[PDB]
Design an enzyme around this catalytic site. Sequence first.
Site, PDB file in Angstrom:
ATOM      1  CD  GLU A 126      -2.530  -1.430  -0.232  1.00  0.00           C
ATOM      2  OE1 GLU A 126      -2.101  -2.287  -1.083  1.00  0.00           O
ATOM      3  OE2 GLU A 126      -3.492  -0.658  -0.449  1.00  0.00           O
ATOM      4  CB  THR A 179      -6.548   6.774  -2.723  1.00  0.00           C
ATOM      5  OG1 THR A 179      -7.599   5.816  -2.886  1.00  0.00           O
ATOM      6  CG2 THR A 179      -6.494   7.120  -1.225  1.00  0.00           C
TER       7      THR A 179
HETATM    8  N1  LIG Z   1      -2.605  -6.372  -7.543  1.00  0.00           N
HETATM    9  C1  LIG Z   1      -3.180  -5.116  -7.655  1.00  0.00           C
HETATM   10  N2  LIG Z   1      -4.557  -4.919  -7.526  1.00  0.00           N
HETATM   11  C2  LIG Z   1      -5.035  -3.639  -7.662  1.00  0.00           C
HETATM   12  N3  LIG Z   1      -4.243  -2.560  -7.915  1.00  0.00           N
HETATM   13  C3  LIG Z   1      -2.883  -2.688  -8.053  1.00  0.00           C
HETATM   14  C4  LIG Z   1      -2.333  -3.975  -7.920  1.00  0.00           C
HETATM   15  N4  LIG Z   1      -1.000  -3.928  -8.082  1.00  0.00           N
HETATM   16  C5  LIG Z   1      -0.715  -2.659  -8.310  1.00  0.00           C
HETATM   17  N5  LIG Z   1      -1.831  -1.882  -8.302  1.00  0.00           N
HETATM   18  C6  LIG Z   1      -1.847  -0.373  -8.547  1.00  0.00           C
HETATM   19  O1  LIG Z   1      -1.968   0.482  -7.413  1.00  0.00           O
HETATM   20  C7  LIG Z   1      -2.971   1.481  -7.370  1.00  0.00           C
HETATM   21  C8  LIG Z   1      -3.934   1.182  -6.181  1.00  0.00           C
HETATM   22  O2  LIG Z   1      -5.001   2.065  -6.360  1.00  0.00           O
HETATM   23  P1  LIG Z   1      -6.218   2.229  -5.278  1.00  0.00           P
HETATM   24  O3  LIG Z   1      -7.063   3.312  -5.944  1.00  0.00           O
HETATM   25  O4  LIG Z   1      -5.845   2.661  -3.852  1.00  0.00           O
HETATM   26  O5  LIG Z   1      -7.051   0.829  -5.117  1.00  0.00           O
HETATM   27  P2  LIG Z   1      -7.537   0.519  -4.131  1.00  0.00           P
HETATM   28  O6  LIG Z   1      -6.304  -0.699  -3.823  1.00  0.00           O
HETATM   29  O7  LIG Z   1      -8.539  -0.228  -5.093  1.00  0.00           O
HETATM   30  N6  LIG Z   1      -7.951   0.924  -2.584  1.00  0.00           N
HETATM   31  P3  LIG Z   1      -9.075   1.915  -2.164  1.00  0.00           P
HETATM   32  O8  LIG Z   1      -9.647   2.583  -3.409  1.00  0.00           O
HETATM   33  O9  LIG Z   1      -8.375   2.901  -1.250  1.00  0.00           O
HETATM   34  O10 LIG Z   1     -10.117   1.076  -1.469  1.00  0.00           O
HETATM   35  C9  LIG Z   1      -3.454   1.427  -8.803  1.00  0.00           C
HETATM   36  O11 LIG Z   1      -2.679   2.458  -9.427  1.00  0.00           O
HETATM   37  C10 LIG Z   1      -2.986   0.088  -9.373  1.00  0.00           C
HETATM   38  O12 LIG Z   1      -2.591   0.023 -10.720  1.00  0.00           O
END
Ligand SMILES: Nc1ncnc2c1ncn2[C@@H]1O[C@H](COP(=O)(O)OP(=O)(O)NP(=O)(O)O)[C@@H](O)[C@H]1O
EC number: 2.7.1.39
Lengths: 296, 296
Positions: A126, A179
């Site tokens: 994260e 985020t």
């Molecule tokens: N295995 C994975 N699953 C999802 N996102 C990933 C992964 N690996 C890398 N990422 C990247 O990391 C970022 C995470 O984005 P985020 O918007 O915080 O998703 P979120 O994990 O869905 N959490 P949240 O929206 O805070 O509930 C994106 O830019 C993704 O491309």
Amino acid sequence: MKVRVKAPCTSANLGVGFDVFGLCLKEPYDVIEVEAIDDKEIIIEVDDKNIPTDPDKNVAGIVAKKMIDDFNIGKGVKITIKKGVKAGSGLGSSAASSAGTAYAINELFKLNLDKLKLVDYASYGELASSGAKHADNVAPAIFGGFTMVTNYEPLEVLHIPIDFKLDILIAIPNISINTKEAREILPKAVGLKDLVNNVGKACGMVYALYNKDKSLFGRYMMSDKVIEPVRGKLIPNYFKIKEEVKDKVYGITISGSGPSIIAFPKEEFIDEVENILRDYYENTIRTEVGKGVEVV
Amino acid sequence: MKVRVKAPCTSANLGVGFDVFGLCLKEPYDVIEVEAIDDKEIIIEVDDKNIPTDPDKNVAGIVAKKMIDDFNIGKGVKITIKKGVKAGSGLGSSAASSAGTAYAINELFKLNLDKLKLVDYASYGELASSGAKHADNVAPAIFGGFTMVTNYEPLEVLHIPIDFKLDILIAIPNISINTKEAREILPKAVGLKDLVNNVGKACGMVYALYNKDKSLFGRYMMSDKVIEPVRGKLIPNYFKIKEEVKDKVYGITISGSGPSIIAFPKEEFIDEVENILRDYYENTIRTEVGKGVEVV
Ligand SMILES: Nc1ncnc2c1ncn2[C@@H]1O[C@H](COP(=O)(O)OP(=O)(O)NP(=O)(O)O)[C@@H](O)[C@H]1O
Ligand SMILES: Nc1ncnc2c1ncn2[C@@H]1O[C@H](COP(=O)(O)OP(=O)(O)NP(=O)(O)O)[C@@H](O)[C@H]1O
């Protein structure tokens, strides 16, 4: 050899619990398989083309590398991910991959790490999009139930299992909210009055869980005047939806940083609240509190 | 005819629970007697010459008048007060009179009011020096145990009885701190980071009580970086005392707005911590959690 797990989506913040509270969902979830390979490289496969396969960018690769190096493991891993939901949905999608990987590595290489350490490792995934190791989504993904991240450096997580029935409805807009941007728009300072309100209402939610009081829990959840009113403006029809389901749910609020919406419908109106949510967002899910990452 | 009660001192804030948390003490307390009289005037007698006898200034007279008018009672009362501690001590001295009077009137005129309504009435006494009806000291004075004022207009109080043993040490400086001034010096705004910290630590304290964890409760109590560090500078030797009792207490902090200090000593060091406190403040008391106003 290999380990396959289901790693659940999670809902953080829950209104006045901003950056502290986390609730594990039973669905959606990622299905992640980790296989030990002789070559020391980390190979990643993911069924969402918008997610990186580079092991230094995909959070699963970041978490695995950190754990493999920390224990001088000496093997590489091939990680295959089938996503439950897209990133940027407010449902802890990245955290599901981070937590699932931490759990899988721990099992695969028999590291015997406790739950807190798994959350700590997952939180490094994260970090790849924060500058800081946020754990409010990875904590519930590992522990299941309701969690509270009460300290960092070192990490502290308090867990409250949810022993009663708690129906959940999730509406998933097709749009995404980044985020980091969601955080930039928040006020830099808050009034002493909002500090008093959120501390009291958040403490009231904890009391509500120990007293199995859904009405109290849901009502206090909706008393945040600092973050939710700001982020709710990024979500089409969010305020209109809140008004329409008003006396039919114990409470409704933004999941994480949005745009997904989480509602706790009253038993009598569950179909009706689901239909209302569906009217606005075809991707609406009925779920309940989950138990965290587990083998599948 | 007449009713006599013991109305306890109370400790509000408890660090991260600023303006929300309240803990009822068993000692000190006021002894208050209320007698119905035919003349409709309210007569007040108090053994502390620094406290007003004017019924419109003494909080007991303010609370009694409000209740007598609200129920068209038609009798006056003679109220005699013997103070447990002086006002401006940070121990809910005025609140003990406000709560004791509310309770006594309720019994004397058989109004059958519930605990929440008694706290609400008592809070009108606390208005005589606020501009606002603060209830964080009168709530514990009425309910006993640990309380959380989670909403105003209307008032909401959540109560958590303390079923376990919790030794308390109170050091009472001879100086006073005016609560209005104590509030003026507080920051007008707080950083989002302090909001997250206090919400998490306060919620952790609630979890600690349900899990009977004194160490956790006490440690989180000491994590406030917003109010306590500011008010602690008004109290001679307060920071030095904290350092001296450091590993001998579960926690120590300012009681209410100060200058009194409240500590939760570990069983093994109770005499030693009491002696240290006495070294600095001759008026040091050993007590425990109380059960609220009661007849005596
Ligand atoms: N295995 C994975 N699953 C999802 N996102 C990933 C992964 N690996 C890398 N990422 C990247 O990391 C970022 C995470 O984005 P985020 O918007 O915080 O998703 P979120 O994990 O869905 N959490 P949240 O929206 O805070 O509930 C994106 O830019 C993704 O491309
Ligand atoms: N019956 C009473 N007991 C104590 N103070 C009273 C009473 N009646 C009126 N007062 C006045 O009200 C003020 C209350 O002061 P305050 O400093 O808040 O005491 P405190 O009730 O001791 N609470 P705190 O210091 O916040 O724990 C003083 O100015 C008193 O003169």
